[PDB]
């Protein structure tokens, strides 16, 4: 029995408690209150744990409600005391919250929809190495989303061919290029060679345009010291931003890399590889809200937030939810956007959302309207065009959409119209204007 | 669309290929063939993005597609990846390449990576477990029986001196290991260095009065790899035989770093699988735990939590036997009744001890001894009201009795109750352990 | 002039704000309101210098002004500072922001910072005491009684060998700590490394013949942090349980550095409050010592000199009780009779042992045991002409007798003389200690 002490409905949280919102489907035969109390007891001191007042450490299931629309499915809000978590350790927060409960037998399925970090805990973490304002200042790109080119003809490329591809795509006018998430250092292309040649390309680009251009050099490595080798060498070459896969590599390695980046002034682009393994099924896993929050705490300036270019259910709203759970300082609780708790970030900076892709410039106005101009749009299409032409197309189209947005004009009814209006100053943009013709 | 080049059902996999067996339920509206080809395309190089040298030597290839027996709109897909796609010695790169972004594929509605076959040409470039079963038994000098453990409880709220006292009482009782809790790294009520000092004092005190080699899985999971290296090196300085790490929360970068450190510095590395059920519970999505057991054996770890078996009321115990043999033997045949889809040859890389934990008491002792054999650890994480040293003595008497009964020639699965109730005639601790739990099978 | 924006008497302070309670006497010619607003303006961003983004979110705000009861032209002013103004983990930045340049304000003629409330969101970003009361009692294994100490005298002019002999004679007598003098760092007559060698030899010799854990507050205050790190690391190498530091002369940068070092290396850090009276004596100017006790508990220190109480003829002992509870408990209510202006919640950060020193002899023993309780240190810095080992034995007998009398159920404040004069029947050292001092209350 757990409800006797772990279910306190008349309890109110403190401003120094960690609040966790679970969505759980219980096994046929157990009531929602018993299962919620059990979730509370398993993510903290369990039953039979005694001689001390082991009550200031117990989690407490302070709320249980039935979710509207689904049968045998509930939300459970649980409150953990602040003195259970190691300061500055995302790994400990996780292995305390989600370390044990998901394999509870008396529950058919469990999902962690949101989690509220107290300010008394947000303060301990370093946070994003730079944030949004700082990284805009470092790159000197104001009032416009940043543009990204993914070099997708990726594996069969020699290091020098990779370098020329990066150089030409950046010469067209993008701001960043991106190493694919699964290219660290492999027989066909070792890491140090790619670093050398993309650094040469970046310097050639900055020399001929005058703008600060970069490349998310992937430093995800088998060990932390090898990762540090790669990061140190990337800095030695003068690279302004590196890349990391926080879920595959881990949170220990990512926290280490973030602390190193803060101390060395390189922006840390985060790629959410392996994420769908734990957030796709609405009945089990960990919602990407929790992972975006855990990242903002651990460290990272950019974060892949996916895209909304047709997956537009109430689900799309959920995206918006977390996309300002990591850009704002205060977020009000409104379950219509999936934000279960109000989160105060204590002036910790925000991370930049990265648009999944769609090199197709027909939702670019839609993306400028959704993610705003404080975001990165990563056209993961290899810069098709017909290269430098596709790059110029993307850049000119972005500048057109943002100039139209600044003029009080709509970009959901006037999207194709403004794109066609812009396509008449350059043939490259004309070669790719709307939902077709790529 | 994809099937023309990524679906080669005639292709046979080389011995130098990486074989993945996905279990996917496709969206209503697409054939299993196109979806398997799409998985192969997205996990390896996809989208035909070959503008700029023919990358057809890097593509994965869905070389098999079959419908799973006894379920509708669900299939298995076997895909083969060239050896050249993976960085040598990097589990993280294997994961990022295989399970990078195919789980969020639209045309599939559910995807679960059920197995991977690592070619010997790739098993050979990982360090593997720091020590393995034989070396670890030699270091501890404990032969011919499973190893015993206890998770110290009260879990939280114990003063470091009290935590040390508890550890000393357990180990003095007759166990071989005590286990720091999963979520105890360093918290206001108990900082890590204090815990380490006092449990090391306890370990030495108990080794003195016993002569055996006791140990404690000192949790070194830390917010940064600098900090976990500090914790591990302070554990070595104290002369600690074994440390602990949570390989899934912490990650594989950190776990590989720690495994290399442990090999260089001669400490056994116990692995705890916290956060796993976030992945390996739903039979229709996630990553089957056997893939993670293989990836651990590659990355590094001497022990690994393998859950428990029909000792705990269980269904598919064939799957748990399968991945126990995957992390413990050297050659395993593709016996798909035991969940093993591919024949995995380990190339003399050592074995990882399975740790049986979670809802175990003295009555489960015989079953486990039959299931895991003697190359395993049994963590008895209720509290045998006589104390904790009596509970340790009871568990020790039970294990030694069951082991001598097994090596005697008895059928322990049919005579476990009898051998335990007969051994209880010479150790009141075990008698209390027997009449506490109501002989749950 | 200032009052229009910096004086918000309606504003209520957030739980994430830093509250300062100044006690100011303004110049004849300005109202208390304008002066409080001016304090708020000068300590936080002032002068309205907002040429180049509205900084009204960073301004301090004088949210309260009251006249002090029983004194003319003197007021209290409560000011609130946003959490965003202070660097996390930096006591020096807290001091530089709060008490930076408001004390030299013209319109005020006297200013005294009487208290600060640290928000939990800011207490959580400091390390705090390296160990705290519970951990330090565990390390020393001394429970249920205060700790005893002696300052070694002759203060100066002792050869390191003689210093070692003195320390050994004290500790062998039955004390728990000896204390290096305040101003003995390393001087021609006695260099530090020699002192360390010989007192370490003495500590080991006395631990041998006693079985208890003796110690010596080795003064590591040095001209540079390099040199104090050298001294601290040589003290650790010798296996010294505890070192010493003068946090006010040396500073808070150096004391925080040393506190982090002590946490990483498991030595208790005794703090001595030399140079304090330069600040916390005049009731009309300076910084009340409770602010410095809070700032120390933040920065780091296991022990802290808290002066003495009506054991020494005293007036406002309520204030000393107040800041003893400020550095020793976890939650303190705003009981302004005890000098505590704000309710301070410490968020499980450990406690700092108060050290009672200065003009104490055996007759004060009961009073102190009632005042500080048993979580405190008593430094008995005249010389019990029998020697120094007999004086140590006398102090030990007195403390144990008074502690067993307290736990027995006696009223030690009314029966201290009786219990001491009765215990003197079984220890001639204590009899000499009794008939030396003429039972000064």
mmCIF file of N, CA and C in Angstrom, chain A residues 48-50 57 83-84 86-89 92 95-96 98-99 102-104 107-108 152-153 155-156 161 164 181-182 184-186 188 190 221-225 230 245 248-253 255-256 274 276-278 280-281 284 286, chain B residues 47 49 52 55 58 84-85 87-90 93 96-97 99-100 103-105 108 153-157 183 185-189 191 222-226 231 246 250-254 256-257 274-275 277-279 281-282 285 382:
data_model
loop_
_atom_site.group_PDB
_atom_site.id
_atom_site.type_symbol
_atom_site.label_atom_id
_atom_site.label_comp_id
_atom_site.label_asym_id
_atom_site.label_seq_id
_atom_site.Cartn_x
_atom_site.Cartn_y
_atom_site.Cartn_z
ATOM 1 N N UNK A 48 9.161 0.283 2.872
ATOM 2 C CA UNK A 48 10.206 -0.312 3.704
ATOM 3 C C UNK A 48 11.533 0.410 3.504
ATOM 4 N N UNK A 49 11.453 1.632 2.986
ATOM 5 C CA UNK A 49 12.590 2.430 2.558
ATOM 6 C C UNK A 49 13.507 1.633 1.632
ATOM 7 N N UNK A 50 14.330 4.147 8.307
ATOM 8 C CA UNK A 50 13.102 4.015 9.080
ATOM 9 C C UNK A 50 13.246 4.706 10.432
ATOM 10 N N UNK A 57 12.061 13.583 2.683
ATOM 11 C CA UNK A 57 12.637 13.133 1.429
ATOM 12 C C UNK A 57 11.631 12.463 0.512
ATOM 13 N N UNK A 83 15.971 18.719 -1.541
ATOM 14 C CA UNK A 83 17.193 18.128 -1.026
ATOM 15 C C UNK A 83 17.382 16.697 -1.465
ATOM 16 N N UNK A 84 16.780 16.294 -2.579
ATOM 17 C CA UNK A 84 17.013 14.974 -3.135
ATOM 18 C C UNK A 84 17.968 14.983 -4.311
ATOM 19 N N UNK A 86 21.329 16.272 -6.606
ATOM 20 C CA UNK A 86 22.640 16.891 -6.613
ATOM 21 C C UNK A 86 22.586 18.172 -7.423
ATOM 22 N N UNK A 87 23.133 19.239 -6.864
ATOM 23 C CA UNK A 87 23.154 20.513 -7.558
ATOM 24 C C UNK A 87 24.012 20.422 -8.807
ATOM 25 N N UNK A 88 23.494 20.939 -9.911
ATOM 26 C CA UNK A 88 24.265 20.999 -11.128
ATOM 27 C C UNK A 88 24.356 19.710 -11.901
ATOM 28 N N UNK A 89 23.543 18.716 -11.573
ATOM 29 C CA UNK A 89 23.637 17.383 -12.161
ATOM 30 C C UNK A 89 22.317 17.030 -12.820
ATOM 31 N N UNK A 92 21.594 13.281 -12.319
ATOM 32 C CA UNK A 92 21.004 12.872 -11.053
ATOM 33 C C UNK A 92 19.520 13.182 -11.014
ATOM 34 N N UNK A 95 18.049 10.273 -13.182
ATOM 35 C CA UNK A 95 18.069 8.985 -12.504
ATOM 36 C C UNK A 95 17.319 8.989 -11.181
ATOM 37 N N UNK A 96 16.872 10.145 -10.693
ATOM 38 C CA UNK A 96 15.944 10.137 -9.573
ATOM 39 C C UNK A 96 14.496 10.116 -10.031
ATOM 40 N N UNK A 98 13.108 9.499 -13.398
ATOM 41 C CA UNK A 98 12.753 8.481 -14.372
ATOM 42 C C UNK A 98 13.605 7.230 -14.236
ATOM 43 N N UNK A 99 14.381 7.111 -13.168
ATOM 44 C CA UNK A 99 15.308 6.003 -13.080
ATOM 45 C C UNK A 99 14.643 4.670 -12.822
ATOM 46 N N UNK A 102 9.444 3.779 -14.597
ATOM 47 C CA UNK A 102 8.915 3.365 -15.886
ATOM 48 C C UNK A 102 8.776 1.861 -16.004
ATOM 49 N N UNK A 103 9.447 1.102 -15.154
ATOM 50 C CA UNK A 103 9.322 -0.335 -15.193
ATOM 51 C C UNK A 103 8.436 -0.855 -14.087
ATOM 52 N N UNK A 104 7.573 0.005 -13.559
ATOM 53 C CA UNK A 104 6.658 -0.414 -12.511
ATOM 54 C C UNK A 104 5.637 -1.381 -13.085
ATOM 55 N N UNK A 107 1.561 -0.668 -13.684
ATOM 56 C CA UNK A 107 1.201 0.399 -14.604
ATOM 57 C C UNK A 107 1.379 -0.115 -16.017
ATOM 58 N N UNK A 108 0.342 0.025 -16.834
ATOM 59 C CA UNK A 108 0.469 -0.394 -18.220
ATOM 60 C C UNK A 108 1.451 0.489 -18.965
ATOM 61 N N UNK A 152 24.444 17.033 -47.063
ATOM 62 C CA UNK A 152 23.930 15.670 -47.038
ATOM 63 C C UNK A 152 24.648 14.700 -47.974
ATOM 64 N N UNK A 153 25.208 15.113 -49.121
ATOM 65 C CA UNK A 153 26.017 14.139 -49.864
ATOM 66 C C UNK A 153 27.236 13.827 -49.031
ATOM 67 N N UNK A 155 28.720 10.904 -46.862
ATOM 68 C CA UNK A 155 29.677 9.869 -46.507
ATOM 69 C C UNK A 155 30.753 9.716 -47.569
ATOM 70 N N UNK A 156 30.354 9.541 -48.818
ATOM 71 C CA UNK A 156 31.324 9.295 -49.863
ATOM 72 C C UNK A 156 32.172 10.492 -50.231
ATOM 73 N N UNK A 161 36.737 17.392 -50.437
ATOM 74 C CA UNK A 161 35.465 17.626 -51.104
ATOM 75 C C UNK A 161 34.434 18.160 -50.127
ATOM 76 N N UNK A 164 35.224 21.783 -49.797
ATOM 77 C CA UNK A 164 34.751 22.610 -50.899
ATOM 78 C C UNK A 164 33.240 22.756 -50.883
ATOM 79 N N UNK A 181 24.771 14.117 -38.237
ATOM 80 C CA UNK A 181 24.851 13.679 -36.853
ATOM 81 C C UNK A 181 25.666 12.409 -36.678
ATOM 82 N N UNK A 182 25.838 11.613 -37.731
ATOM 83 C CA UNK A 182 26.515 10.330 -37.615
ATOM 84 C C UNK A 182 27.871 10.325 -38.302
ATOM 85 N N UNK A 184 31.383 11.218 -37.162
ATOM 86 C CA UNK A 184 32.391 11.702 -36.235
ATOM 87 C C UNK A 184 33.784 11.557 -36.824
ATOM 88 N N UNK A 185 34.241 10.318 -36.992
ATOM 89 C CA UNK A 185 35.535 10.048 -37.614
ATOM 90 C C UNK A 185 35.521 8.594 -38.053
ATOM 91 N N UNK A 186 35.436 8.361 -39.353
ATOM 92 C CA UNK A 186 35.207 7.025 -39.866
ATOM 93 C C UNK A 186 36.154 6.759 -41.021
ATOM 94 N N UNK A 188 36.520 6.328 -44.036
ATOM 95 C CA UNK A 188 36.518 7.141 -45.239
ATOM 96 C C UNK A 188 36.876 8.591 -44.965
ATOM 97 N N UNK A 190 38.483 10.880 -41.564
ATOM 98 C CA UNK A 190 38.853 11.040 -40.171
ATOM 99 C C UNK A 190 38.560 12.462 -39.728
ATOM 100 N N UNK A 221 32.286 11.921 -29.571
ATOM 101 C CA UNK A 221 33.441 11.050 -29.667
ATOM 102 C C UNK A 221 33.262 9.887 -28.712
ATOM 103 N N UNK A 222 34.037 8.817 -28.883
ATOM 104 C CA UNK A 222 33.833 7.635 -28.040
ATOM 105 C C UNK A 222 34.125 7.857 -26.576
ATOM 106 N N UNK A 223 35.036 8.755 -26.231
ATOM 107 C CA UNK A 223 35.383 9.010 -24.844
ATOM 108 C C UNK A 223 35.384 10.508 -24.590
ATOM 109 N N UNK A 224 35.365 10.880 -23.312
ATOM 110 C CA UNK A 224 35.360 12.296 -22.974
ATOM 111 C C UNK A 224 36.687 12.950 -23.309
ATOM 112 N N UNK A 225 37.797 12.231 -23.156
ATOM 113 C CA UNK A 225 39.067 12.845 -23.511
ATOM 114 C C UNK A 225 39.242 12.954 -25.014
ATOM 115 N N UNK A 230 38.879 16.780 -29.696
ATOM 116 C CA UNK A 230 38.227 17.354 -30.864
ATOM 117 C C UNK A 230 37.784 18.781 -30.604
ATOM 118 N N UNK A 245 25.746 15.558 -29.656
ATOM 119 C CA UNK A 245 24.509 14.784 -29.660
ATOM 120 C C UNK A 245 24.212 14.376 -28.229
ATOM 121 N N UNK A 248 22.653 10.549 -27.350
ATOM 122 C CA UNK A 248 23.526 9.403 -27.560
ATOM 123 C C UNK A 248 24.756 9.495 -26.671
ATOM 124 N N UNK A 249 25.449 10.633 -26.717
ATOM 125 C CA UNK A 249 26.644 10.811 -25.905
ATOM 126 C C UNK A 249 26.316 10.747 -24.426
ATOM 127 N N UNK A 250 25.294 11.464 -24.002
ATOM 128 C CA UNK A 250 24.858 11.452 -22.625
ATOM 129 C C UNK A 250 24.787 12.850 -22.054
ATOM 130 N N UNK A 251 24.347 12.914 -20.809
ATOM 131 C CA UNK A 251 24.280 14.194 -20.133
ATOM 132 C C UNK A 251 25.546 14.512 -19.368
ATOM 133 N N UNK A 252 26.291 13.501 -18.931
ATOM 134 C CA UNK A 252 27.583 13.764 -18.318
ATOM 135 C C UNK A 252 28.539 14.384 -19.322
ATOM 136 N N UNK A 253 28.686 13.748 -20.479
ATOM 137 C CA UNK A 253 29.550 14.298 -21.508
ATOM 138 C C UNK A 253 29.047 15.643 -21.980
ATOM 139 N N UNK A 255 27.260 17.924 -20.282
ATOM 140 C CA UNK A 255 27.547 18.936 -19.278
ATOM 141 C C UNK A 255 29.015 19.305 -19.295
ATOM 142 N N UNK A 256 29.894 18.310 -19.413
ATOM 143 C CA UNK A 256 31.317 18.597 -19.523
ATOM 144 C C UNK A 256 31.601 19.489 -20.716
ATOM 145 N N UNK A 274 18.566 10.270 -31.614
ATOM 146 C CA UNK A 274 18.030 9.208 -30.773
ATOM 147 C C UNK A 274 16.823 9.654 -29.968
ATOM 148 N N UNK A 276 13.621 10.240 -30.767
ATOM 149 C CA UNK A 276 12.368 9.547 -31.022
ATOM 150 C C UNK A 276 12.294 8.196 -30.340
ATOM 151 N N UNK A 277 13.408 7.678 -29.835
ATOM 152 C CA UNK A 277 13.356 6.415 -29.121
ATOM 153 C C UNK A 277 12.578 6.569 -27.830
ATOM 154 N N UNK A 278 12.542 7.773 -27.268
ATOM 155 C CA UNK A 278 11.898 7.992 -25.980
ATOM 156 C C UNK A 278 10.749 8.981 -26.038
ATOM 157 N N UNK A 280 8.059 9.303 -28.866
ATOM 158 C CA UNK A 280 7.138 9.340 -29.985
ATOM 159 C C UNK A 280 5.762 8.838 -29.603
ATOM 160 N N UNK A 281 5.691 7.810 -28.771
ATOM 161 C CA UNK A 281 4.426 7.211 -28.390
ATOM 162 C C UNK A 281 3.837 7.999 -27.232
ATOM 163 N N UNK A 284 4.108 6.171 -23.659
ATOM 164 C CA UNK A 284 5.312 5.787 -22.946
ATOM 165 C C UNK A 284 6.470 6.642 -23.418
ATOM 166 N N UNK A 286 9.439 9.858 -22.579
ATOM 167 C CA UNK A 286 9.714 11.124 -21.920
ATOM 168 C C UNK A 286 9.476 12.219 -22.937
ATOM 169 N N UNK B 47 17.814 9.568 -48.687
ATOM 170 C CA UNK B 47 17.299 10.666 -49.502
ATOM 171 C C UNK B 47 17.959 10.728 -50.879
ATOM 172 N N UNK B 49 20.736 11.608 -51.688
ATOM 173 C CA UNK B 49 21.473 12.863 -51.819
ATOM 174 C C UNK B 49 22.906 12.536 -52.226
ATOM 175 N N UNK B 52 27.142 15.307 -55.284
ATOM 176 C CA UNK B 52 28.583 15.188 -55.477
ATOM 177 C C UNK B 52 29.070 13.871 -54.881
ATOM 178 N N UNK B 55 28.142 6.448 -53.737
ATOM 179 C CA UNK B 55 27.910 6.056 -52.352
ATOM 180 C C UNK B 55 27.138 4.779 -52.214
ATOM 181 N N UNK B 58 28.007 2.522 -49.296
ATOM 182 C CA UNK B 58 27.733 2.881 -47.915
ATOM 183 C C UNK B 58 26.292 2.646 -47.504
ATOM 184 N N UNK B 84 32.225 0.117 -42.951
ATOM 185 C CA UNK B 84 32.899 1.398 -43.073
ATOM 186 C C UNK B 84 32.096 2.555 -42.516
ATOM 187 N N UNK B 85 30.867 2.333 -42.070
ATOM 188 C CA UNK B 85 30.068 3.459 -41.620
ATOM 189 C C UNK B 85 30.328 3.837 -40.176
ATOM 190 N N UNK B 87 32.551 4.460 -36.647
ATOM 191 C CA UNK B 87 33.828 4.751 -36.026
ATOM 192 C C UNK B 87 34.221 3.612 -35.105
ATOM 193 N N UNK B 88 35.480 3.209 -35.194
ATOM 194 C CA UNK B 88 35.972 2.110 -34.385
ATOM 195 C C UNK B 88 36.014 2.506 -32.919
ATOM 196 N N UNK B 89 35.476 1.651 -32.065
ATOM 197 C CA UNK B 89 35.586 1.867 -30.642
ATOM 198 C C UNK B 89 34.577 2.814 -30.049
ATOM 199 N N UNK B 90 33.559 3.202 -30.801
ATOM 200 C CA UNK B 90 32.594 4.212 -30.376
ATOM 201 C C UNK B 90 31.208 3.591 -30.354
ATOM 202 N N UNK B 93 28.647 6.211 -31.657
ATOM 203 C CA UNK B 93 28.490 6.357 -33.095
ATOM 204 C C UNK B 93 27.659 5.229 -33.670
ATOM 205 N N UNK B 96 24.137 6.339 -32.844
ATOM 206 C CA UNK B 96 23.737 7.470 -33.668
ATOM 207 C C UNK B 96 23.520 7.072 -35.119
ATOM 208 N N UNK B 97 24.244 6.073 -35.610
ATOM 209 C CA UNK B 97 24.037 5.671 -36.991
ATOM 210 C C UNK B 97 22.811 4.783 -37.122
ATOM 211 N N UNK B 99 20.206 3.940 -34.694
ATOM 212 C CA UNK B 99 18.950 4.395 -34.116
ATOM 213 C C UNK B 99 18.904 5.914 -34.094
ATOM 214 N N UNK B 100 19.663 6.541 -34.979
ATOM 215 C CA UNK B 100 19.710 7.982 -35.039
ATOM 216 C C UNK B 100 18.365 8.629 -35.250
ATOM 217 N N UNK B 103 13.501 6.151 -35.769
ATOM 218 C CA UNK B 103 12.363 5.958 -34.892
ATOM 219 C C UNK B 103 11.322 7.037 -35.077
ATOM 220 N N UNK B 104 11.718 8.200 -35.565
ATOM 221 C CA UNK B 104 10.775 9.261 -35.822
ATOM 222 C C UNK B 104 10.368 9.305 -37.273
ATOM 223 N N UNK B 105 10.301 8.145 -37.910
ATOM 224 C CA UNK B 105 9.894 8.079 -39.301
ATOM 225 C C UNK B 105 8.380 8.072 -39.393
ATOM 226 N N UNK B 108 6.408 4.664 -40.859
ATOM 227 C CA UNK B 108 6.303 3.654 -39.820
ATOM 228 C C UNK B 108 5.548 4.267 -38.657
ATOM 229 N N UNK B 153 19.580 0.073 2.790
ATOM 230 C CA UNK B 153 18.416 0.880 3.090
ATOM 231 C C UNK B 153 18.316 1.025 4.599
ATOM 232 N N UNK B 154 17.838 2.175 5.101
ATOM 233 C CA UNK B 154 17.189 3.333 4.474
ATOM 234 C C UNK B 154 17.931 3.947 3.307
ATOM 235 N N UNK B 155 17.211 4.149 2.208
ATOM 236 C CA UNK B 155 17.833 4.655 0.994
ATOM 237 C C UNK B 155 18.452 6.024 1.229
ATOM 238 N N UNK B 156 17.631 7.000 1.589
ATOM 239 C CA UNK B 156 18.059 8.375 1.761
ATOM 240 C C UNK B 156 17.955 8.773 3.222
ATOM 241 N N UNK B 157 18.578 9.891 3.555
ATOM 242 C CA UNK B 157 18.473 10.416 4.895
ATOM 243 C C UNK B 157 19.377 9.768 5.910
ATOM 244 N N UNK B 183 20.257 6.596 -7.099
ATOM 245 C CA UNK B 183 20.151 8.042 -7.158
ATOM 246 C C UNK B 183 20.897 8.728 -6.032
ATOM 247 N N UNK B 185 24.202 10.256 -5.528
ATOM 248 C CA UNK B 185 25.523 10.647 -5.985
ATOM 249 C C UNK B 185 26.198 11.537 -4.957
ATOM 250 N N UNK B 186 25.662 12.736 -4.756
ATOM 251 C CA UNK B 186 26.167 13.627 -3.718
ATOM 252 C C UNK B 186 25.104 14.684 -3.477
ATOM 253 N N UNK B 187 24.439 14.613 -2.337
ATOM 254 C CA UNK B 187 23.289 15.456 -2.067
ATOM 255 C C UNK B 187 23.459 16.110 -0.710
ATOM 256 N N UNK B 188 22.778 17.225 -0.475
ATOM 257 C CA UNK B 188 22.961 17.977 0.769
ATOM 258 C C UNK B 188 23.045 17.134 2.023
ATOM 259 N N UNK B 189 22.164 16.153 2.149
ATOM 260 C CA UNK B 189 22.165 15.329 3.344
ATOM 261 C C UNK B 189 23.376 14.419 3.423
ATOM 262 N N UNK B 191 27.165 14.187 1.294
ATOM 263 C CA UNK B 191 28.076 14.451 0.198
ATOM 264 C C UNK B 191 28.902 13.211 -0.086
ATOM 265 N N UNK B 222 28.425 11.305 -11.956
ATOM 266 C CA UNK B 222 28.645 12.679 -11.553
ATOM 267 C C UNK B 222 28.170 13.612 -12.647
ATOM 268 N N UNK B 223 27.965 14.890 -12.330
ATOM 269 C CA UNK B 223 27.464 15.817 -13.345
ATOM 270 C C UNK B 223 28.413 16.035 -14.496
ATOM 271 N N UNK B 224 29.716 15.940 -14.277
ATOM 272 C CA UNK B 224 30.685 16.092 -15.343
ATOM 273 C C UNK B 224 31.663 14.935 -15.288
ATOM 274 N N UNK B 225 32.338 14.690 -16.405
ATOM 275 C CA UNK B 225 33.309 13.607 -16.411
ATOM 276 C C UNK B 225 34.527 13.962 -15.585
ATOM 277 N N UNK B 226 34.840 15.251 -15.457
ATOM 278 C CA UNK B 226 35.848 15.666 -14.493
ATOM 279 C C UNK B 226 35.475 15.210 -13.096
ATOM 280 N N UNK B 231 35.804 11.345 -8.472
ATOM 281 C CA UNK B 231 35.207 10.361 -7.580
ATOM 282 C C UNK B 231 35.837 8.994 -7.770
ATOM 283 N N UNK B 246 25.879 4.554 -13.845
ATOM 284 C CA UNK B 246 24.563 4.422 -14.465
ATOM 285 C C UNK B 246 24.716 4.738 -15.943
ATOM 286 N N UNK B 250 23.931 8.627 -17.495
ATOM 287 C CA UNK B 250 25.213 9.283 -17.698
ATOM 288 C C UNK B 250 25.584 9.328 -19.169
ATOM 289 N N UNK B 251 25.387 8.235 -19.878
ATOM 290 C CA UNK B 251 25.665 8.170 -21.293
ATOM 291 C C UNK B 251 26.679 7.096 -21.612
ATOM 292 N N UNK B 252 27.001 7.007 -22.896
ATOM 293 C CA UNK B 252 27.998 6.061 -23.359
ATOM 294 C C UNK B 252 29.364 6.682 -23.527
ATOM 295 N N UNK B 253 29.434 7.976 -23.819
ATOM 296 C CA UNK B 253 30.717 8.658 -23.801
ATOM 297 C C UNK B 253 31.351 8.560 -22.426
ATOM 298 N N UNK B 254 30.598 8.930 -21.398
ATOM 299 C CA UNK B 254 31.127 8.874 -20.049
ATOM 300 C C UNK B 254 31.375 7.447 -19.613
ATOM 301 N N UNK B 256 32.210 4.875 -21.487
ATOM 302 C CA UNK B 256 33.417 4.377 -22.127
ATOM 303 C C UNK B 256 34.653 4.983 -21.493
ATOM 304 N N UNK B 257 34.621 6.286 -21.219
ATOM 305 C CA UNK B 257 35.725 6.920 -20.509
ATOM 306 C C UNK B 257 36.003 6.216 -19.193
ATOM 307 N N UNK B 274 19.678 2.042 -14.717
ATOM 308 C CA UNK B 274 18.620 3.008 -14.497
ATOM 309 C C UNK B 274 18.234 3.668 -15.809
ATOM 310 N N UNK B 275 16.975 4.089 -15.891
ATOM 311 C CA UNK B 275 16.372 4.755 -17.040
ATOM 312 C C UNK B 275 16.138 3.810 -18.206
ATOM 313 N N UNK B 277 13.875 1.249 -18.616
ATOM 314 C CA UNK B 277 12.479 0.992 -18.939
ATOM 315 C C UNK B 277 11.839 2.115 -19.733
ATOM 316 N N UNK B 278 12.450 3.297 -19.764
ATOM 317 C CA UNK B 278 11.997 4.346 -20.658
ATOM 318 C C UNK B 278 12.101 3.894 -22.096
ATOM 319 N N UNK B 279 12.896 2.860 -22.355
ATOM 320 C CA UNK B 279 13.216 2.434 -23.704
ATOM 321 C C UNK B 279 12.746 1.015 -23.988
ATOM 322 N N UNK B 281 10.544 -1.239 -22.550
ATOM 323 C CA UNK B 281 9.347 -1.843 -21.983
ATOM 324 C C UNK B 281 8.302 -2.140 -23.049
ATOM 325 N N UNK B 282 7.903 -1.132 -23.810
ATOM 326 C CA UNK B 282 6.842 -1.301 -24.791
ATOM 327 C C UNK B 282 7.315 -2.193 -25.927
ATOM 328 N N UNK B 285 7.831 -0.266 -29.424
ATOM 329 C CA UNK B 285 8.672 0.888 -29.678
ATOM 330 C C UNK B 285 9.798 0.900 -28.664
ATOM 331 N N UNK B 382 10.489 -6.722 4.969
ATOM 332 C CA UNK B 382 11.596 -6.764 4.023
ATOM 333 C C UNK B 382 12.924 -7.050 4.713
#
